[PDB]
Design a protein around this ligand. Structure first.
Ligand SMILES: [Zn+2]
Ligand SMILES: [Zn+2]
Lengths: 52, 113, 111
């Protein structure tokens, strides 16, 4: 690992601390009274694909 | 030698201008573990330090053996290379708290800029 | 953005009906209740870019301490302009420039 850069980078990634807040960009709260469907149109396709 | 020193300082200032343009167009490489502003400041400071060292080296190579400052520096009794550089070629960059002169006014160092 | 009560000027907190399954903005100081238009109750930006270009005034061309360039205006193609960096002053802030024309007074970049 000391003479190889890729394995060293793998070890570095495995050591460094990473929280959810680091990768998160924005969080939102929405009102949706239908458990099996949704009001948002952008995500409607993906969630209906999941449920089906 | 004064022509050579002036050319070195002008080339360094042109290099600093290029670094400024690159940082102002998002074309600057970021030193790991440091922000964009910190990397830009460190790179400009390194360029200016290299400029002063090059000008001083030119000035110190110019000196004859009969030069008295050279004789004192070569004896090791008083003075060094930086003294010759600042006396003859360039004083260099002034650092306050390990950084260049801050913006004590509103986004400038003096009301003449 | 949050709305205010139309009768006693207090804040309209969101409320949910168990029987009707609707989102309603209701004032807690009275019985007033108005139907909500959007379900976006709350939004938090961990990394935000607001205030970077929001610090702009219409009289910035009269400041004599600002540098003057000759960049081309995208709208009226003027030959004089005034530039400055980002008004946001965090440590992560970019060093990009914002140019202001002396005729249309709009803010535009160089990219
Ligand atoms: Zn009310
Ligand atoms: Zn214009």
């Amino acid at each position: 690992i000391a003479l190889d850069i890729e394995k060293a980078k793998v070890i570095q990634s495995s050591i460094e601390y990473t929280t959810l807040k680091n990768v998160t960009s924005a969080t939102e709260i929405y009102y949706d009274p239908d458990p099996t469907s949704t009001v948002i149109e952008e995500d409607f396709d993906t969630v209906e694909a999941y449920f089906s | 030698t004064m022509k050579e020193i002036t050319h070195a300082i002008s080339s360094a200032k042109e290099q600093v201008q290029e670094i400024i343009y690159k940082a102002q167009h998002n074309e600057l490489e970021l030193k790991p573990g440091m922000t964009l502003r910190e990397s830009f400041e460190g790179e400009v400071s390194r360029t200016l330090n290299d400029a002063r060292d090059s000008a001083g080296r030119s000035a110190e190579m110019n000196l004859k053996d009969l030069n008295n400052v050279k004789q004192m520096v070569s004896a090791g009794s008083k003075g060094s290379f930086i003294n010759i550089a600042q006396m003859s070629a360039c004083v260099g960059q002034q650092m306050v708290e390990g950084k260049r002169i801050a913006f004590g006014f509103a986004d400038r160092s003096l009301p003449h800029f | 953005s949050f709305r205010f009560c139309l009768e006693c000027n207090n804040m309209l907190y969101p409320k949910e009906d168990k029987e009707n399954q609707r989102l309603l903005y209701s004032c807690r100081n009275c019985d007033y209740t108005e139907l909500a238009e959007d379900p976006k109750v709350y939004r938090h930006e961990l990394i935000t870019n607001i205030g970077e270009t929001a610090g702009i005034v219409d009289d910035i061309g009269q400041d004599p301490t600002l540098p003057r360039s000759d960049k081309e205006c995208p709208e009226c193609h003027s030959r004089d302009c005034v530039f400055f960096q980002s008004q946001q002053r965090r440590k992560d802030t970019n060093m990009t420039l914002f140019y202001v024309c002396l005729n249309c007074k709009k803010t535009f970049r160089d990219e």
